[PDB]
Amino acid sequence: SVTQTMKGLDIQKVAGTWYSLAMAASDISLLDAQSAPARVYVEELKPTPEGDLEILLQKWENGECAQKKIIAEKTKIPAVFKIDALNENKVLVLDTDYKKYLLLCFENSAEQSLACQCLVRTPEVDDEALEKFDKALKALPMHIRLSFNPTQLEEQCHI
Amino acid sequence: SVTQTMKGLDIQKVAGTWYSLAMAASDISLLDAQSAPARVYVEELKPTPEGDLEILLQKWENGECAQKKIIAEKTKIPAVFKIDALNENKVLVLDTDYKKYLLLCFENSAEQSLACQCLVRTPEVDDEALEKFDKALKALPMHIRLSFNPTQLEEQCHI
Numbered sequence: 044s045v046t047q048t049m050k051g052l053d054i055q056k057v058a059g060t061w062y063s064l065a066m067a068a069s070d071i072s073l074l075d076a077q078s079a080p081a082r083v084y085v086e087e088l089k090p091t092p093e094g095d096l097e098i099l100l101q102k103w104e105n106g107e108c109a110q111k112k113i114i115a116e117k118t119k120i121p122a123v124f125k126i127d128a129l130n131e132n133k134v135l136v137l138d139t140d141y142k143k144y145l146l147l148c149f150e151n152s153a154e155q156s157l158a159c160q161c162l163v164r165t166p167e168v169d170d171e172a173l174e175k176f177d178k179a180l181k182a183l184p185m186h187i188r189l190s191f192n193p194t195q196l197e198e199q200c201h202i
Numbered sequence: 203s204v205t206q207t208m209k210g211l212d213i214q215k216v217a218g219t220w221y222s223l224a225m226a227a228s229d230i231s232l233l234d235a236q237s238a239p240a241r242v243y244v245e246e247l248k249p250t251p252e253g254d255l256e257i258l259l260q261k262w263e264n265g266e267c268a269q270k271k272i273i274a275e276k277t278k279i280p281a282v283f284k285i286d287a288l289n290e291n292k293v294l295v296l297d298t299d300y301k302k303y304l305l306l307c308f309e310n311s312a313e314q315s316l317a318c319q320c321l322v323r324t325p326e327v328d329d330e331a332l333e334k335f336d337k338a339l340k341a342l343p344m345h346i347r348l349s350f351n352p353t354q355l356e357e358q359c360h361i
């Protein structure tokens with residue numbers, strides 16, 4: 044369970060282009076296949092004026108790379124947003140420098156499905172951002188991790 | 203490319219029961235699906251009197267958990283065995299204490315497919331054996347890692 048958040052977060056400053064450089068999850072089944080439920084590739088983060096967080100992403104669904112937009116609503120905690128659905132889902136922002144890397148996790152309640160990503164601003168392998176990611180995950184019950192190469196990061200659905 | 207071998211290896215002492223507690227590989231495609239080519243679950247290591255290494259394992263193939271045996275022949279290097287096939291495949295033993303953990307890698311030539319496992323003697327999560335595994339992998343170009351839980355380790359094909 045995630046007890047690492049970004050103190051002092053300014054969300055407006057996370058807007059723009061992102062790349063899902065690596066991903067990790069609590070169960071193998073969340074990331075194993077091409078259409079696994081947590082295999083989501085972030086494209087853009089779009090904070091709303093009201094301080095909500097629109098997420099633009101790609102997902103492989105029935106043989107193809109589909110585009111999706113979801114909205115995570117603000118909460119009392121600056122680093123935590125809620126996607127109301129069949130479940131209470133939370134987006135947690137763990138850490139960021141705004142200009143290079145952002146670590147975030149998604150979690151529901153059930154047991155608890157948890158997936159986290161290291162997002163970066165450019166199609167480049169950032170070893171320092173990846174160290175910070177592994178550091179964060181040491182405290183979490185993860186059983187699968189994937190990372191993409193720069194070629195893949197320029198393809199839809201990282202193919 | 204693997205430049206970590208077990209100095210002083212006595213193979214005869216690796217015989218018996220093993221469990222594939224974690225696995226890592228150079229390409230996502232080698233481990234991603236249930237029937238991915240490197241998704242192999244070790245059952246037993248059986249050194250031959252002549253110093254070859256028989257490997258008993260399970261593999262999910264066309265909807266089912268199949269049993270297989272393969273033979274890796276000795277070489278001039280005690281820690282390196284060869285499986286002659288369509289490719290020159292090597293089994294490399296990186297480290298072991300014989301009684302708890304064994305790290306090993308499999309590699310071919312092409313680019314180079316590489317997969318490594320942390321094997322343990324019991325259906326138990328060995329954090330020290332897993333630290334040694336991550337340490338070993340730091341030097342290798344891995345892009346997917348999986349680890350199993352004790353329930354899974356007692357099921358065929360870790361289902």
Ligand SMILES: CN(C)CCCN1c2ccccc2Sc2ccc(Cl)cc21
Nearest residue numbers: 080081083098132149150151156157158
């Ligand atoms: C789009 N939908 C298939 C998944 C949305 C919810 N979602 C999520 C929620 C709870 C646990 C794990 C995940 S994976 C994930 C990765 C990226 C994003 Cl942006 C959202 C999620």
Ligand SMILES: CN(C)CCCN1c2ccccc2Sc2ccc(Cl)cc21
Nearest residue numbers: 239240242257291308309310315316317
């Ligand atoms: C049985 N066959 C599907 C795979 C045999 C060769 N094999 C292998 C070789 C070169 C690169 C990667 C691998 S994965 C693997 C994992 C365990 C074992 Cl024991 C062997 C292998």
